């Protein structure tokens, strides 16, 4: 089943975007999470696009 191999690829994409360092100024980590959200947004677009191919319509 290659839907499974796809899902493992997805998990490897979400894990390539590690959470930010929790220690720091309140708005320093606001900016950290701010940049983290863009990357997670690309990953979400890509992975949702892939997952649609095996489930979709």
């Amino acid at each position, epitope marked *: 089943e*290659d*839907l499974l*191999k*796809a899902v*493992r*690829l997805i998990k*490897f*994409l979400y894990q*390539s975007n590690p959470p930010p360092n929790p220690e720091g100024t309140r708005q320093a980590r606001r900016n950290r999470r701010r940049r983290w959200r863009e990357r997670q947004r*690309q990953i979400h677009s*890509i992975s949702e*696009r*892939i997952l649609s*191919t*095996y489930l979709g319509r």
Partner: antibody
Framework: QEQLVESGGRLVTPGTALTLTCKVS????????LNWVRQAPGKGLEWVGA??????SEWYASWAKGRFTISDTSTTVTLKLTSPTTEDTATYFC????????????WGPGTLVTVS | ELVMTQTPSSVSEPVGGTVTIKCQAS??????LSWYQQKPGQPPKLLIY???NLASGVPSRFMGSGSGTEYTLTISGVQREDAATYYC????????????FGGGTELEII
């Protein structure tokens, strides 16, 4: 920055396993799609397969599955033809997708393999 | 599984004429089409990506349009260096339809 250079192209009898290597240099990205594309002389482009660098995730076309094995080394990406036939005689390019959006931005110059 | 059928196989045009190449996808690829140019002796190069979007370092005379599964590469002003083979690529490596190339086109300028 981004540059891809492939090697290994030879002339071999059928059934002779053959390893092509793509040395990849100048990439600032953790993962990216590393593709292998094939063109027979005088003919068109044929997508062989692809790998996602950081993972163990390899994908192949319906016609290539099991006859080709893409492997990933720290600086290297190898395409193994396990049982070449005279219809596998072609030029092989490695391509790179940096955006993970599917399009090939960076190509190598290519190599030439003959099978007789 | 994915099959890109590239309708015009050969097209010749006098300079200043508009060439229209069409690719048909065997399945809905949405934004996953990209157009590539190759000239003899050398690897290909990107023209269009995400089906409408001109690549960097490319002249603006190249156009493309997704409509459903019919995708179009439209060159308006042709030039001499436009003599080359053009391909469309579609799909994604991890999609259940794996990425596939069209049959190709040859463009020679008179």
């Amino acid at each position: 920055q981004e540059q891809l250079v492939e090697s290994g192209g030879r002339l071999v009898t059928p059934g002779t396993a053959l390893t092509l290597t793509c040395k990849v240099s100048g990439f600032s990205l953790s993962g990216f799609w590393l593709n292998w594309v094939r063109q027979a002389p005088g003919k068109g482009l044929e997508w062989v397969g692809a790998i996602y660098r950081g993972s163990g995730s390899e994908w192949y076309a319906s016609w290539a599955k099991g006859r080709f094995t893409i492997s990933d080394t720290s600086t290297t990406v190898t395409l193994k033809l396990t049982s070449p036939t005279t219809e596998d005689t072609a030029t092989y390019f490695c391509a790179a997708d940096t955006t993970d959006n599917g399009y090939f931005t960076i190509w190598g110059p290519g190599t030439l393999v003959t099978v007789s | 599984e994915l099959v890109m059928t590239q309708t015009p196989s050969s097209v010749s045009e006098p300079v200043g004429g508009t060439v229209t190449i069409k690719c048909q996808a065997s399945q809905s690829i949405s934004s996953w089409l990209s157009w590539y140019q190759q000239k003899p002796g050398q690897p290909p190069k990107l023209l269009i990506y995400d089906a409408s979007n001109l690549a960097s370092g490319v002249p603006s005379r190249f156009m493309g349009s997704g409509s459903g599964t019919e995708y179009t590469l439209t060159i308006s002003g042709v030039q001499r260096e436009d003599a080359a083979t053009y391909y469309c690529l579609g799909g994604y490596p991890a999609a259940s339809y794996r990425t596939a190339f069209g049959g190709g086109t040859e463009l020679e300028i008179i």
